[PDB]
Amino acid sequence: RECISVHVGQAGVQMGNACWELYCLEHGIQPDGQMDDSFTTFFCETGAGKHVPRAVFVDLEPTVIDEIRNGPYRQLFHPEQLITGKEDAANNYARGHYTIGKEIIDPVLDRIRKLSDQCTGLQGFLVFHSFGGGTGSGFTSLLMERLSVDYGKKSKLEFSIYPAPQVSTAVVEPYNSILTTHTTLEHSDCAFMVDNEAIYDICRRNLDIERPTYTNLNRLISQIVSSITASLRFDGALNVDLTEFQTNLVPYPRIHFPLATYAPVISAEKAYHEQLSVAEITNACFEPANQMVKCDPRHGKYMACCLLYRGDVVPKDVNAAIAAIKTKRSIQFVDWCPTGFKVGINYQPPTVVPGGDLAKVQRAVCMLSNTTAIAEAWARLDHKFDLMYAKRAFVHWYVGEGMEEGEFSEAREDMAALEKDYEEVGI
Amino acid sequence: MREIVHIQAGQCGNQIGAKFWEVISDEHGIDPTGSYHGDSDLQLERINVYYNEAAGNKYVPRAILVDLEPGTMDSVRSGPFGQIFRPDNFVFGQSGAGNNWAKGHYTEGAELVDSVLDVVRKESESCDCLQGFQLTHSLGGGTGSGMGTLLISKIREEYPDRIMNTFSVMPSPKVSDTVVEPYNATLSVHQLVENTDETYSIDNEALYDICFRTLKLTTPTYGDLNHLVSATMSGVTTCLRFPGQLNADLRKLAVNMVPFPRLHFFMPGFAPLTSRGSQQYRALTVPELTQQMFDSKNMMAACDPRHGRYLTVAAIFRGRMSMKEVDEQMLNVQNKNSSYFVEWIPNNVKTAVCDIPPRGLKMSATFIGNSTAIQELFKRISEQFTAMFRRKAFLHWYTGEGMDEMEFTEAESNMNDLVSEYQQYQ
Amino acid sequence: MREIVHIQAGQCGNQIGAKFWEVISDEHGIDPTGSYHGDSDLQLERINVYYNEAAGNKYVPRAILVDLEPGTMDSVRSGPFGQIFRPDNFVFGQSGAGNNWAKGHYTEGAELVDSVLDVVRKESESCDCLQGFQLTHSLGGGTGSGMGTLLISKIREEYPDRIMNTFSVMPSPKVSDTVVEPYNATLSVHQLVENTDETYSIDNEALYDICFRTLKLTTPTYGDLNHLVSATMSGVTTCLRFPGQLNADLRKLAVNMVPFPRLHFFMPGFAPLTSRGSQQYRALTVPELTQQMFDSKNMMAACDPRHGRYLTVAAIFRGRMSMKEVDEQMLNVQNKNSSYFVEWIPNNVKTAVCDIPPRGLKMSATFIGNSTAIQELFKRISEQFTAMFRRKAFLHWYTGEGMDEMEFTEAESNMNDLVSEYQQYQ
Amino acid sequence: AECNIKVMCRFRPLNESEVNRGDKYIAKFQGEDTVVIASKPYAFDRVFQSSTSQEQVYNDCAKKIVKDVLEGYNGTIFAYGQTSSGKTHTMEGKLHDPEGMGIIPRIVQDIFNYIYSMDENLEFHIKVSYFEIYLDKIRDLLDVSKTNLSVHEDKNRVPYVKGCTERFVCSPDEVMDTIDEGKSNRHVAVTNMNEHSSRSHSIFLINVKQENTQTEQKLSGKLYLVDLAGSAKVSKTGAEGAVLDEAKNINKSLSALGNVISALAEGSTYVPYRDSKMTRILQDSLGGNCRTTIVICCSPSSYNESETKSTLLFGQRAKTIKNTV
Ligand SMILES: Nc1nc2c(ncn2[C@@H]2O[C@H](COP(=O)(O)CP(=O)(O)OP(=O)(O)O)[C@@H](O)[C@H]2O)c(=O)[nH]1
Ligand SMILES: Nc1nc2c(ncn2[C@@H]2O[C@H](COP(=O)(O)CP(=O)(O)OP(=O)(O)O)[C@@H](O)[C@H]2O)c(=O)[nH]1
Ligand SMILES: Nc1nc2c(ncn2[C@@H]2O[C@H](COP(=O)(O)OP(=O)(O)OP(=O)(O)O)[C@@H](O)[C@H]2O)c(=O)[nH]1
Ligand SMILES: Nc1ncnc2c1ncn2[C@@H]1O[C@H](COP(=O)(O)OP(=O)(O)OP(=O)(O)O)[C@@H](O)[C@H]1O
């Protein structure tokens, strides 16, 4: 059992630098490249007393790549795997897909082929990017389309950072997100999502960090993506694999948008005063403001829900906790899936980074759940897109790259097809 | 990796260009002789983005100084950082233009433009992969507007795909040190509106207005004015000169700020702008900086933004800071002032930050704004041109070089068009 | 948390405002340079309620000094605590008002009021959550009554929900250092009676009357008068600057003292007031303090309360003390003197105490009283205005600024109305 | 004073690349004025079916335009659509054949045939020009030396070309000769969708100046014949290398005039003609003293259903436009 990953954009490599430092300290891998069947999923055996991750950080702009080469984690990652481009995507879906995308996929696509040939138990793929930019939108759809036609049957665990409702980093991110989702709607099996102001709200209230940064945001994100793959690494009472995320969460092949959340988030001084059990954290993850997306779950209905625990959590009190969620009428489940619960447990507990913002806890939980609540966000993104599309704003840059007005209409109607599917399935 | 070819045209362009290499040399820690004496290793990470490597660990700048008056080069060469430039790049004529756009564009420029194209071709092919062109000129005069705008046309013909960036100072009616400003102004914007992808509209009176209120210099010279505008030149190209948590290249700034091919005339700004007698009484936290960035009186253009609506704005921060306080300041600044922002765009702000601030300051940022208030400058410039053109005043000197009066009318046709273009989106 | 924006208008307002920051700086233990050198940790608990944090552990005050005479700021800036204030807050004109309400309200104030509104907006948005405005002015003169009352009207328009507190000194017939006092007085109370929620009526002759009997200073200056009135400014805002067993915010004082929207003109007082030659012969226990608080001659207003009836009174104590002796003193003080208290209210007294007394004193309190005896001041002020207005004396200077004589009559209509309002409840 | 721009449509038969893939014939016609596509009517002035020959399209569309441009007004005809829609065959065709020849030789032949029918005293001065906008440069095809021309304004602020090779012509056969050598110099590339893919916009001008000797009344009319390229998708064409640069400049132009039609349809204030320099040529056609007639071409295959629907609604936005004639 093994799995490979590729990181795209500033959002990907910043999570890439933050997640692989977490994976190395879990398995006792020192940052100099060296220290049985626990690290074989992500890390390889480089002859004798040396390891290499199964990672390929790709990015067109070279500032992030050489910083990793001149960073602290020099000897861990392969120097050849750290791919760098020549010219930035420049916040454009077309530029990272046709001009700069086509001339760099050929080094990239053949690399993941031979990097998979040395492996034998490749379960699937997981990517890291953000559709708010150019390289995260154009190049990501290109490679994911280029490998889906080759492999197809293997899974694809997308991790995209969508823009917030009112907070935003760019101005043309509806154009970047609406075009790349036209290709991602059919090829991606599942895609977990993260938001900007929502994750700031997590560390503001519970973790009381009044001045956080992206370095702190990626740590708890690393706890999420490391905890979902913690079942295949360490032994568990109920082992789950990456293929469970396709069967239990995707009721229809074109409705493949779960939410993401994590608990318990608690500081050092607050950890010793707050009680740690499954009952209080089971209510915390279902709390609406404790999610990683500004979206009201009370408005919609949960299509499916998955739970994955860590640490010394016995199966008694965890089953009594979810039974209290069923009779709690604050949230409402859809009639099309009454038994929409997938429980998981791993024995290895949540770790802690030296000097990190999160505290050590003897147990944790991460919930991924499909719901019809995210239709209003697509309505919001589609609504604001019509305001700029009516004035033809920021269009001359895309057609200057090689595109036209036609596929903008395809990107509009394809999201319009998604809304009528979300209101139909939500009946 | 993504080299930028610098080209200093005109008298003022050589001054701010000379100050531009001065202020960034302290950031990279380069001696005036050309050797490195810095402290950080990241200064050498992206020293090639502006400089070229040479023997003895010497770094010559990729600057091309062009001017039709040899006395200007003697002052730049005899400056503090005058010896670091390449002697071969100092190409220049002998006879000045005398504040005539026709002389520096048709006759006096045409004899020298064959000499400068072979020089910039050397710096272009010598690099690994060129990104764009960072030019400095003035819309007034003949050598800045005539010859500086000419090579913009030739570089567009040779390199139509690269970015054409211009830091251009422009005249105003309150402060006017030249009689032929509106004729030179209206002829220059005809070329800048069609060829260049991005331009920064800097008004000279606002350089004096900002130094009274915030900086309160009692004896300001032109060198003090060059310092604050050259900081903006360092802010726009900070993301590729040093690493950052959210890098924005010059092309990444273009797509967010240039919603239409003609509407690319920006309005720069910079902060912190505080005197020495009031530095201790100010907090370097970002909310005190954000209110100064979007302030109506902080920018280096005299157009008041409250009389119009912002089309799109960008703020490139510098220094280690918290992103939540940075991002949330962009929320309340636009929603509380929704009248001064267009409703047909959901988010007008573009964010960017770097981990390496300027030397001597821990927190700083640069304000970049494309607003519809800039048409007020095009209004007064157009009325000054139409007031002098309607009786053919000061045109017989231009006809001596073979220039036709229809080109002045064609420049006048472009003036009201771009004025009406900004009025469409307000 | 509940910040208070200070605004020093007029000459006297700058003096008592300068003394106000002086006396509280010793309580918080702030150096004149701006650094902290105190002893208690509670001083930093609520230092942000008046000051703003800055680099180097320096605390700049949130003071906005406004005046139409630049010589006043030179004396305040060159004072003991003059260097701690922000230089940007020192906004001021050049030409004085010359004791004319029309000049400082219509012409001389209107050119500067655009400049001060952008300054107070900076201090208002920079805070976490503003509570109110602590203003100091004088009803005499033109810059205090004209421009000071003007921005009260503008702040009411922008912040109608916040508290508008004013420590206003007012003239009297026995001591009158200005001829145009009743004209400036009657025009100022027209704005204070409608806009402000609370006001402290301080009479200048009572500042001299209290220093003869109790303090017996042989050579009193204006600085000695500023010390006793500034202590009252510290007493009103003690509950939110330090913890206490029964905290009363400025809004909590307003609802108890302002029974009707117009009847909010208070009568301050302070104790202990004892000379150095009689300090050893006095007991600091509360009954000797309580009889001094409600004394007819202790207050800083010349209106004798025995000629009327108290509408409502508040006493904010300071220092560690016993509550039974405090509360029981409020019982016998009102029932023994039931003729001097209204029978249509069962309890006129409001209690409050703090655990942190002033430096150098273990027991202290401030007397705050809304009494119907204040109409005697409005009687004599109205008769002085009607005596000069009935033949249009000293009005032609006001008409030069475009002011109408009907506004003087409208101010006269407000004067007899509030006089009759106090007479209704006596 | 005001005349509506005539909007006509034409569908073609399925070419060799579409019938072997198995595309369905979705083109459904209802009379002459309107066409039904996916149960959606689209009203036009005249819709041409697949069986419409070359001569039938010319007599229906551009027959009266020859009379209008000779009366004293201006004329302009251009074709909008996607690649392989049949724009080149409609206008160019095969020039040397009587039947297979397109519109632009038929326009030439009708002008000279009309002059022979007129009296001898009407003296005609016809001068021809031919250039193309390729890689954002106006390269002349009549002369190979100059590769970029300027666009200057005339007396009434109407933009037009300067420096171009204005060949004074006498006989109609000479006009056929300069058209043949011009098309031979045309940079025609090969792609998967069309071997004869015109990768740029060929503008052909016929500046017909005329004056009567008796009345001494001078008249002129600018007759623009524009044959634009196709707004093709990169995934369908499979473009790579130099052809990508050719796709950029054509897509800027069709998107630029797409803003002009939407600006003129919704009735904007500024009407941004100055987005692309190709749009600067078509100012007098859309907002001048001209009688414009747009003829959109589309394919009946199901594989190009999205781009063809965009072309029809683009035609609907063109119906609400009026000239200042
Ligand atoms: N902020 C600064 N502005 C300057 C400086 N020098 C000139 N100027 C301003 O720019 C205006 C015109 O720019 P120039 O001095 O360069 C005139 P130019 O050299 O281009 O033509 P000629 O000298 O006649 O050959 C000028 O009138 C000033 O208002 C300077 O050093 N700093
Ligand atoms: N208790 C104090 N009273 C003062 C002091 N200075 C002045 N005054 C009294 O206040 C009266 C008027 O107040 P001001 O001195 O401020 C006159 P203002 O500055 O507002 O107008 P102009 O000076 O004409 O511009 C004045 O006649 C005094 O009776 C002082 O320092 N302390
Ligand atoms: N949460 C989080 N988001 C990030 C981080 N870094 C980048 N992003 C996201 O990335 C978005 C910008 O898109 P990018 O793909 O990173 O753009 P870029 O890397 O600057 O490259 P260009 O698009 O060419 O300008 C922002 O809106 C962020 O939300 C990060 O470290 N943490
Ligand atoms: N109406 C029609 N009837 C029959 N055949 C046609 C028709 N239109 C086009 N064709 C065929 O298509 C071939 C080439 O098509 P054409 O070059 O016109 O495509 P196009 O879309 O105009 O290309 P471009 O994108 O360069 O404009 C011709 O050789 C011709 O046989």
Numbering used by the authors:
A (entry chain I): 2 to 36, 52 to 443
B (entry chain Q), C (entry chain P): 1 to 426
D (entry chain Y): 5 to 329
What did the paper state?
They are highly dynamic tubular polymers assembled from α/β-tubulin heterodimers, which are arranged in a head-to-tail manner to form protofilaments, with ~13 protofilaments associating laterally to form a hollow polar tube. In vertebrates, both α- and β-tubulins have multiple isotypes encoded by different genes, which are intrinsic factors in regulating microtubule functions. The GTP bound to β-tubulin at the E-site (exchangeable) is hydrolysed within the microtubule assembly proceeding via longitudinal contacts with α-tubulin, while the GTP bound to α-tubulin at the N-site (non-exchangeable) plays a structural role and is never hydrolysed.
Moreover, our recent study showed that α4A/β2A microtubules had different microtubule polymerization properties and special curved growth features. Surprisingly, similar analysis of α1A/β2A and α4A/β2A microtubules revealed a clear contraction of α4A/β2A relative to the α1A/β2A protofilament. Additionally, this contraction is in a progressive expanded manner that increases with each dimer along the protofilament, such that the first neighbouring α4A/β2A dimer contracts by ~1.5 Å relative to α1A/β2A microtubules, then the second dimer contracts by 3 Å, and so on.
